[PDB]
Symmetry: D2
Subunit: 726 residues, 4 copies
């Protein structure tokens, strides 16, 4: 026995806040959190405690420390089957990563609709508010490999596998409502342009390089999702604080056979929130696993990620009533024109047990639909339907990937398909063909019907010649980028301009910069002029005179496109750093900690070393991390209680902690003599908005701090931060 | 509903004779035949009756007859995910065949010892006569592909997987007691020489070609196994009627640590029996699945294949007591010198459900041993230990092949190995390494011991320098081929001669034939001269004067090496053709069927057409097959009852039936007017040994016929068959 | 030297009739025969005479008869990299066979049109009677595995790769002018029905079994091609003596953009000839490689397969 | 074998030797080299036994392991000198 005698090696099987206990496999951390998919995985879950170590053939091993040799300093023998099995399995652990969205973090949960949607769709999982559907959800970046960093600037994937009673439905979406390109035939061109360049394989997890902006400058259909990536949408604070979208128009089909067009949304119940660039980029260094870690720890704390599914619904007769084509995936449907109707709630409430087996091997594919749904002719969706089945043949080793446990349906599946690599199911049917008489034709086809019927495609009329031709209705590139720009707050616009300026600064061929600036001049001249100034480029007279693109169906803004214009802050699950000193005023710390706990806000006690410090009254304070070990990047706010401020006041790390939090627009609260830190951040005696300060942490100090946290960041500080050397 | 009203599409779930019912998956034909391994497969068996047809993702299919198209004469659409999933799975059905032994037929069963072997081995499966061990057995040929014929001349494999309580033990043997080569480094050379030649990929399933005999002539270590392959050992009648051998000397290890050398044997309880060459070759065209079919139908009839496991045991102190090396796998241990101890019995009593899932995917490997067994330094065994783990990574897709259901142990298996393609087990251990504290070092190593202990190699002393060198003790090639030759009956020697003469006549380069004849002259001058006469080669004076090789430890024969020298005939499970006519004498047919039933011999009723015929008393006789549809090749004996003999007397097919059966040495019985057929096969009026004839089927008539069947073939007929044009 | 003194190990590099010489690799047997594709394969052809035996990394092997062991009767050592490379390669020789038409036999050749077809097609390989296009052709059965027999009753494949100056064109046909089924959606059903049945994997190379005729009896669209298969068309004498067809209607497209419907044919210039059933069946036993052998030996004799 | 897809990884251009390589190994996935040798095995007479083994020597010779002396029993045990 090598475990400590006090049992401190094993995390408690109860919800605990981030950092309080080591993290564990979900079934050991939360054994009573159950759903029908999690229970169905029990046939393959493997324990370990009290069992003998064996080969994969069940032979007990006596010595797992040594190879078999001829003498204890002699050569290794070929007859060592125990060594060779163990090193063979090791040698073949890796499988190909996903071509795109290779970097991702996943969790188990459940979905329930708010009311039956039987009037608009016959989909069984939406038919009854008491029908619970298990889900598995994977969030991801796009460009980087599986070992790249989480808080890069990039689009994020948001993929949900619903294990329904009539089939698996995968809703495979991203966190922006459009994509970069119009037709799937260009997807390898676009992805090869954003990915690391082919001669040297640089840069990882970044679009800030010549080939991406060469392609963008030559393909103005990309400019709308480029706008979203350059905004703070491209750097979410967490997977819990971003929107999701299916992007394409799909169809709902009800039992009377009526089709309604639909676009799918997920609303984050934790609100929308993003990092600022300098913080995101620094965080890819200090904690490249920050979003993976944050998701896992929220679930362990009981801060479950929750999202509301909603639908934009357009009747078939209104297909042509907009200035843009509903089938064009570079266009959004403004919520001012078609509101999102709330449909039901998804809660993610359990981590996987093994990341490879459940996350790495999961396969999502937007062609996995169920009766009550159907596709449209969007030409990006149409090509996606080919790709996701094809790519699993190499990634997951063959055509039996639906037998890997995470991908298995929970409902029945039976057919005439046989064999393939890795075949698990042993069919007993005398027949492997239909029609057959030798098994009375079972399993049998099922007519379409209101419930539990066979799939049938909506009989949409097709009329046209066979052409490789883009619809002229798709040939408008600039009005949606402009609607996006005008919908952002002034600070969000500043952040967009800085995103394009930073990215084009890394493009080495200056002509590519110039061509991008020309495209910006076709969107909005204030944007193009501001990015041009940062690049030292002067707009020509012709550029200054480009006429702005039209409004989108009369709109000159839509606030639902902004992260922040409409307040939706939620503090639960956020975290605050508390900078300790060697003799902390304990009454300050009591007040701080209990106010935080009352609103579900976590704290991390930090100091210049690990171990403990003792407060004014003898209270022993356990230290979570050092200043340098858990930097202000990883927290939402900073609080300094009073005490012996001289302990830390000349500590460079403590001072820089506050400078960094201040640059990144985070709320900071200073009690008592911690107000001496006002000189480090240049705060005036009569103080400034976004800095909370009092003689003590009582009265309204914690309410004021918590108000600031619900507004996320102190945007009014932006003009104050440029002077600051941090 | 497509099945017939009368239910005649479904075979009865009871044992039935060959041809009486359609064959079926084993769990449908024999649902109450169980063993621990068959019951463990229940988690992956899939049924079909009363289930809906679905995609692999569980979506019900309405129309499984058509692709989705734009118009009913229009192009097929890419959004048809149902068509693409079904065609994608089909497109990827095949996996690589085994590099050798690709053609093979398998069944489930169980093994039980006759007594505890704890005095000589601690192997748990041999510890107690009431210990029942499930087995899965695969029989195979060596050279041909998975689609080559069964009754070729070849060595046969005989591989048994024992699913023990302490691990899977695979005993991977062949049907001769030696192999062709001494050192595993030559196995790709030998196998490439026997396989189809590389320019044109000819011949299939045959060693009768230049490159095989080129290698044999240049590698006299091959000649011993070449002698067995050229004898009738190379064309067994059934996998039920051949012996098995592990070939290599292994070790048993007891609880005190004492090592005993062991060679393994399987003795067929249905006795030893082989085809003749003409019959075997012709059967590869009339029924290339003859052995596969016979094994499956024997098991459906209850004629379970039974084998006794036997051990040749040699104390460690007797390693050098023989005049050949015990580690040389081209040498056998004569049973006259070391008897076979009968240790237990294996019964094969259930067919698979699905051939691909259970037979094609099964992985056997001789390095899969358990505590109580160990290896020796036999240099062919030593290299095999590398090959069988390595080859499964491509053949079965990766390192998780032990998770494919047929390969799973039934005992516990736990370790720190993770990932790899199509990983099924979901590990919950917090640790994936040891030593660990975080899971109190579970799963834990186990010291070796008398029962349930960890595996420890026997501490054999190794002394020598690192060399690529054949032991001088292996350098003797002729004395075993000669002992085998001298042990055969005279007709078994004639068949050997004929095997070499046939094969060498197909070698195009005449010098290779000459070099093989020179080798045969080093074995036995009579053999060499008989082969040389058939090739038109004359031995030189030097060849006439080569001294024979020495006896083996004083033996000049061992009758246990002959198939036939000692009678071991068992008729149960054999099959007789009864040639019908349009008015059979019912009293002959009653007596025949009754006597056959009493001995468990099956019959097939044959005629010139399908349907039925009516006997003299009006009995309706159903016809199983035509004379041409079920030739004499497929049966053990032929009986012709009396009746309207004119109906068939001039039928060239019925005459030929009896000519073919006669040429192939089969017992033939003729009742009343059926004796007119004596003229087609030239039998004198006074009759001949091996032709049963009488006025009626009589009962003494049947005893005589069944006596001949217990002796298998009528060897004394051989000088009479050269006349017969058949 | 292991070769005989008289040179009789080596087949004459000139045309010889079947059985006169051992058969050989084509570039050794007929070194003077060439075409543009055979020339382009030269960079990957590997010889052998007068070269040292090496690992795949180019290290010369001294003893290719023994593993490395501790003493000449001792255990094999894990450091024997020569043994492990040679056995690793052997261990991974096989690739999956083709799902259908796994048994087949192939040869190089060339095609030339009799005149320009530019009035009906702008296909380059049909534009000029002087333009010669290399081909590679494989003939096959459908149902059996790669190690099944040649003279079974089955449909035959006839597939031609044309290595044109404007891309590869593959004409992938059969020896009858129709197929068994109408819609590709049913191909896995039809092919599972003809293939060896799934419990026991019998019968090989034969449609004479319950599941095939169950499917036919329930799918009368199959009866046309079944007629062909049951005729002596199902048992050709040689790949040289069978017709070929593309089966489908395709389109030719000329330079003016006009489309013409076309169906493709191959006419055997050796004429049409089939076995009889008892002969074909017994031949699967006496020489399961009869068609592969006959093709190879015709080409070695100069009896070149020719098709129109 | 898994990373690079099979046993012909030495034929991937970067990994190819620049010196000659010839032997009797054949096939495997994505086989590039087309062997013209009538023989795929040795010893052979049909190609006069080429390509041939080469005795070790001072230059251009076959590989031979150094004949280190091995003395000990078959053990899974760490040398005490390593502790
Ligand atoms: C024509 C090709 C194609 C196109 C046009 C797209 N994708 Fe895709 N996508 C792939 C081909 C692909 C892929 C190659 O099939 C991936 C990689 C690995 C996998 O299983 O699927 C994939 C993965 C992938 C994943 C990760 C799924 C997971 O976590 O495993 C997400 C979230 C998306 N995609 C989302 C999108 C959205 C919202 C798109 C446009 C609206 C889109 N993809 C277009
Ligand atoms: C010494 C005499 C040998 C005998 C009796 C023997 C027996 C067998 C048998 C019975 C099988 C078939 C297992 C099954 O039914 O699935 C087999 C497969 C195999 N053998 Fe051995 N073998 C011998 C020597 C060797 C040697 C020296 C090597 C390697 C150098 C070797 C490599 C293989 C390979 C690669 C397969 C295919 C295994 C698979 O794909 O799972 N054989 N052999
Ligand atoms: C229209 C009737 C058809 C004919 C005459 C035909 C002909 C052929 C031929 C001759 C080959 C072998 C090529 C070779 O020698 O390498 C082949 C291979 C194949 N065929 Fe088609 N075929 C037909 C219908 C189909 C259909 C409808 C499908 C599927 C929808 C199909 C799927 C395949 C597959 C999967 C292979 C193996 C190809 C490979 O592995 O390279 N066959 N077929």
């Amino acid at each position: 026995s090598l475990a400590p005698e006090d049992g401190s090696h094993r995390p408690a099987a109860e919800p605990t806040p981030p950092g309080a206990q080591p993290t564990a496999p979900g079934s050991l951390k939360a054994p009573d959190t159950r759903n029908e998919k999690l229970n169905s995985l029990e046939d393959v879950r493997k324990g370990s405690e009290n069992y003998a170590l064996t080969t994969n053939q069940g032979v007990r091993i006596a010595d797992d420390q040594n190879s078999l040799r001829a003498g204890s300093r002699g050569p290794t023998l070929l007859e060592d089957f125990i060594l060779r099995e163990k090193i063979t399995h090791f040698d073949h652990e890796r499988i190909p990563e996903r071509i795109v969205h290779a970097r991702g973090s996943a969790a188990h949960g459940y979905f329930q609709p708010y009311k039956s949607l039987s009037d608009i769709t016959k989909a069984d999982f939406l038919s009854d508010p008491n029908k619970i559907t298990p889900v598995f959800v994977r969030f991801s970046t796009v460009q980087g490999g599986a070992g790249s960093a989480d808080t890069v600037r990039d689009i994020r994937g948001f993929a949900t596998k619903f294990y329904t009673e009539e089939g698996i439905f995968d809703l495979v979406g991203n966190n922006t409502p459009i994509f970069f390109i119009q037709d799937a035939h260009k997807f390898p061109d676009f992805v090869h342009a954003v990915k690391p360049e082919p001669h040297w394989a640089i840069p990882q997890g970044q679009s800030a390089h010549d080939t991406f902006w060469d392609y963008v400058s030559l393909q103005p259909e990309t400019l709308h999702n480029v706008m979203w990536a350059m905004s703070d949408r491209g750097i979410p604070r967490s997977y819990r604080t971003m929107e999701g979208f299916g992007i394409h128009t799909f169809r709902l089909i009800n039992a009377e056979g009526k089709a309604t067009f639909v676009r799918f949304h997920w609303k984050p119940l934790a609100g929308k929130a993003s990092l600022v660039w300098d913080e995101a980029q620094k965080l890819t260094g200090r904690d490249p696993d920050f979003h993976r870690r944050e998701l896992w720890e929220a679930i362990e704390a009981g801060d479950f990620p929750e999202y509301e599914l909603g639908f934009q619904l357009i009747p078939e007769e209104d297909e042509f009533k907009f200035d843009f084509d509903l089938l064009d995936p570079t266009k959004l449907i403004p919520e001012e024109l078609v509101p999102v109707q709330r449909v039901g709630k998804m809660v993610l409430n359990r981590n996987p047990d093994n990341f490879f087996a459940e996350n790495e091997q999961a396969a999502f594919h937007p062609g996995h639909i169920v009766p009550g749904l159907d596709f449209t002719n969007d030409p990006l969706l149409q090509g996606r339907l080919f790709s996701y089945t094809d790519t699993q043949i190499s990634r997951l080793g063959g055509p039996n990937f639906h037998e890997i446990p995470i991908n298995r349906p929970t409902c029945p599946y039976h057919n005439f398909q046989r064999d393939g690599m890795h075949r698990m199911g042993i069919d007993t049917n005398p027949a492997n063909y239909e029609p057959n008489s030798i098994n009375d034709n079972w399993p049998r086809e099922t007519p379409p019907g209101p419930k539990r019927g066979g799939f049938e495609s909506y009989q949409e009329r097709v009329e046209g010649n066979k052409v490789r031709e883009r619809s002229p209705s798709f040939g408008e590139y600039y009005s949606h980028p402009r609607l996006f720009w005008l919908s952002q707050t002034p600070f969000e616009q500043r952040h967009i301009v800085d995103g394009f300026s930073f990215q084009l600064s890394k493009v080495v061929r200056p002509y590519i910069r110039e061509r991008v600036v020309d495209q910006l001049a076709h969107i909005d001249l204030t944007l193009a002029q501001a990015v041009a100034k940062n690049l030292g480029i002067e707009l020509t007279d012709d550029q200054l005179n480009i006429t702005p693109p039209p409004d989108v169906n009369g709109l000159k803004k839509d606030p639902s496109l902004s992260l922040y214009a409409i307040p939706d802050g939620d503090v639960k699950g956020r975290v605050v750093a508390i900078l300790l000193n060697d003799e902390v005023r304990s009454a300050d710390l009591l007040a701080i900690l209990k106010a935080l706990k009352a609103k579900g806000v976590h704290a991390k006690l930090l100091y210049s070393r690990m171990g403990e410090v003792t407060a004014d009254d003898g209270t022993v304070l356990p230290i979570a991390a050092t200043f340098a070990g858990a930097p202000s990047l990883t927290v939402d706010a900073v609080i300094v209680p009073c005490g012996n401020i001289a302990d830390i006041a000349d500590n460079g790390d403590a001072n820089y902690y506050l400078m960094e939090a201040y640059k990144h627009l985070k709320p900071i609260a200073l009690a008592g003599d911690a107000r001496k830190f006002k000189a480090t951040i240049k705060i005036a005696d009569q103080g400034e908005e976004g800095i909370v300060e009092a003689d003590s942490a009582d009265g309204s100090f914690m309410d004021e701090l918590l108000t600031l946290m619900a507004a996320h960041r102190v945007w009014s500080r932006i003009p104050k931060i440029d002077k600051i050397p941090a």
